[PDB]
Amino acid sequence: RKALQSYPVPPRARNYERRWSSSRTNPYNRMFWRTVLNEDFARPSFWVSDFRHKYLAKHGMDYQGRVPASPAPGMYQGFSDVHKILANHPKPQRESRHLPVMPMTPRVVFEHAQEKRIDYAKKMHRDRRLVEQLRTHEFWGWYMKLQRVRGRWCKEHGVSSRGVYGPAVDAAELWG
């Protein structure tokens, strides 16, 4: 069934199993509390959690500081699909000093293809109400021309538009 390795990004909803469990939605907000609360849950993402084992050896101490993110240029150069031997971070760089550039993996390009089709969707909605706030906005503006031209006509032709009776049934301010 369309192996997940085919989808550009692994699918959002992940269907499972469980003959005796019927619910489409994956229970997020539980996969979130664990992970945020427990540091260990997610593999260290080697670099940000290496660089110890390289400070301890060369400095005789625990690093005792926040490790830099964004692995140094030159690390994980033989790896090809890092994405796990890292966080989902990109393959760091060459061992260069050139400005950081995303190595346009098939994945990064897809994200570009989202943040353009997100701006696309929010733009096709943003200007429906912009023209919807002309149609109804100008329909009212015109409808009040109607009640005005009806307002003018209904005085010379004297149609009080309040029943068969004269205003003497109105002046009582009863039902009648």
Partner RNA sequence: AAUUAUUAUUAUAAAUAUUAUUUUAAAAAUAUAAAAAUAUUGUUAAUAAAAUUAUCAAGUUUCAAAAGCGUUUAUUAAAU
For 50-74, give the DSSP string: SSSSSHHHHHSS---SPPPSS--TT
Q: Which does 97 bind (CB under 5 to 8 A by kind): RNA, other proteins, none?
A: other proteins
Q: Which is nearer to RNA, 7 or 32 (CB)?
A: 7
Q: Which is nearer to RNA, 84 or 122 (CB)?
A: 122
Report residue 136 as tokens.
Answer: 């109804």
Only one residue has tokens 């023209």, namely 131
Asked if 139 touches other proteins (CB under 8 A), the answer is yes
Spatial distance between the Cα atoms of 49 and 55, rounded to a whole number of angstroms: 11
Amino acid symbol at 43: R
**Segment 140 to 159, residues that bind other proteins, using CB under 8 A:** 140, 143, 147, 150-151, 154-155
Collapsing DSSP to helix, strand or coil, 172 comes out as: coil
Report residue 94 as tokens.
Answer: 């060459």
Q: Which is nearer to RNA, 17 or 81 (CB)?
A: 17
Question: Can you give the binding site for RNA, defined by CB under 7 A?
Answer: 7-13, 17-21, 114, 117-118, 121-122, 125-126, 128-129, 132-133, 135-136
Residues 7, 53, 94, 127: which binds other proteins (CB under 8 A)? 127
Q: Which does 29 bind (CB under 5 to 8 A by kind): RNA, other proteins, none?
A: other proteins
Instruction: State the CB neighbour count (10 A cutoff) for residue 92.
Output: 20
Q: Which is nearer to RNA, 14 or 157 (CB)?
A: 14
Collapsing DSSP to helix, strand or coil, 167 comes out as: helix
Q: Which is nearer to other proteins, 3 or 172 (CB)?
A: 172
Residue 176 · residue 169 · CB < 8 Å: yes
Stretch that binds other proteins, among 16-24, 54-62, 109-117 (CB under 8 A): 109-117
